[PDB]
Design a binder for this molecule. Structure first.
Ligand code: HEM
Ligand code: HEM
Ligand SMILES: [K+]
Ligand SMILES: [K+]
Lengths: 249, 249
């Protein structure tokens, strides 16, 4: 049900130019997984019932950066500031979601559609809305479903964002990559999830919860078997995520 | 703009009977100021914009009791549990606001009108909405005005609740009573505020802020000069406070 705001031609020019510079920067710095995380944690605080939180620029605020769920994302914010300063017309809100869309594209994933127009809001949401890696399916539906308003299908496909990147013991406490090729966006997260625990590879309890839920497990199976299906469902879910509370939510 | 819900006759019987038992209990235990504080801190978390928080029973939850603003109110909650258990039909939400109305009446203050029907909600609001004693007039309008939706007049009159009770260094860190007769509800809070700092009596920076604001100071002056006016404005404000988010807000 989205109705995206009109933005000036100069604004659209800056988007296009920012998108290209983000590709080169993110590729050079090898920081696509951290930028995807930055985009997700920005959006993932949306609560449909109160219409608070969401991808509106607040993650750069030191008070939101201090949320323990956000450990290490100050690095992300810092890395992007010089480039953002080249695009003063853009909202931080738009800039961070664009970086997430680009992070996915330059690691070889699907092209997530992007619509500009998000405004930078003044107040960060309360801490505690992002998911707890130590919990399971009920918790996941509470956060993605009851708060953000995404579907069970969205939960599984977005979990596949872990196909890139790694945990760090000094940030969450968990450690290592989910896949053997953590700078490559593919369906390997699901393939590893199905094969058991491979030495050196990470599985959060929240990942494992997908294997035991009667709705989530068919989806893991479909994605492990069909990367195209994964990419389609991923692109849908990431667009919805990136637009929570925006242009009608 | 209130439209109060219908409640059963058995519910109204329990209100009337609870009101009388609360008088005797609160008088015997000399805990009227702590019960007023309990009622206020229950209500004072309302945010009109999101319609979250407010006098809906959540302060008895250990997670809300743990808010540092609420230090010492677990005592209040404990004191009331035996009596509440005599009125299982009543919501905790109604019971705590009734105790606040009674606390004011048995110390000799105005009769604040009371309407039953508040429901006990499952989730406590985020911490941090209650006012900071170390701040001033802007802060007060942010909390009472922008969040709760009360008037500048309401802020000054409700500040007069400090005419009963005292701070404790092991609860907020501040210490002592605002008045020489802290179990007597009268306009003495304003009279002391005007006379300067009397030895042994407390003034928070938030109290003092009332003296320097061009809207609040006329009100302090009116109340110090006219206790009847104070009681009228107090009764209005406390009813509005006790009904935030309830029966239309
Ligand atoms: C489903 C529930 C989720 C939980 C419990 C969760 C939890 C975690 C944890 C604990 C970390 C490691 C942080 C560290 O120590 O560095 C992590 C990292 C990561 N998360 Fe998730 N996450 C979830 C969903 C998501 C979603 C929906 C996305 C985006 C589509 C995502 C993208 C990532 C990425 C890319 C990393 C790697 C970061 C890096 O390499 O530095 N995650 N998550
Ligand atoms: C206006 C901003 C307010 C601030 C900054 C504030 C702050 C404080 C503080 C710091 C304490 C002492 C807590 C302790 O250490 O025990 C206190 C106590 C108290 N507050 Fe206020 N308060 C405010 C408004 C209110 C309102 C609106 C009411 C109710 C009408 C109220 C009723 C009381 C009462 C009765 C006590 C005495 C409690 C006792 O004797 O144990 N206050 N407040
Ligand atoms: K991978
Ligand atoms: K007094």
């Amino acid at each position: 049900g989205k109705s995206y705001p009109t933005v000036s031609a100069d604004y659209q020019k800056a988007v296009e130019k920012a998108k290209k510079k983000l590709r080169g920067f993110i590729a050079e710095k090898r920081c696509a997984p951290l930028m995807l995380r930055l985009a997700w944690h920005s959006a993932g605080t949306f609560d449909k019932g109160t219409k608070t939180g969401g991808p509106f620029g607040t993650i750069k605020h030191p008070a939101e950066l201090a949320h323990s769920a956000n450990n290490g994302l100050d690095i992300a914010v810092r890395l992007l500031e010089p480039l953002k300063a080249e695009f003063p017309i853009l909202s931080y809100a738009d800039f961070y979601q664009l970086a997430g869309v680009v992070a996915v594209e330059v690691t070889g994933g699907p092209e997530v559609p992007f619509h500009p127009g998000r405004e930078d809001k003044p107040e960060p949401p309360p801490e505690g809305r992002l998911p707890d890696a130590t919990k399971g399916s009920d918790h996941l539906r509470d956060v993605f479903g009851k708060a953000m308003g995404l579907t069970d299908q969205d939960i599984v496909a977005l979990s596949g964002g872990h196909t890139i990147g790694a945990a760090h013991k000094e940030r969450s406490g968990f450690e290592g990559p989910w896949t053997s090729n953590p700078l490559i966006f593919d369906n390997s997260y699901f393939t590893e999830l199905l094969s058991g625990e491979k030495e050196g590879l990470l599985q959060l309890p929240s990942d494992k919860a997908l294997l035991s839920d009667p709705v989530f497990r068919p989806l893991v199976d479909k994605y492990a078997a069909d990367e195209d299906a994964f990419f389609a469902d991923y692109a849908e879910a990431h667009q919805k995520l990136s637009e929570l509370g925006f242009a009608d939510a």
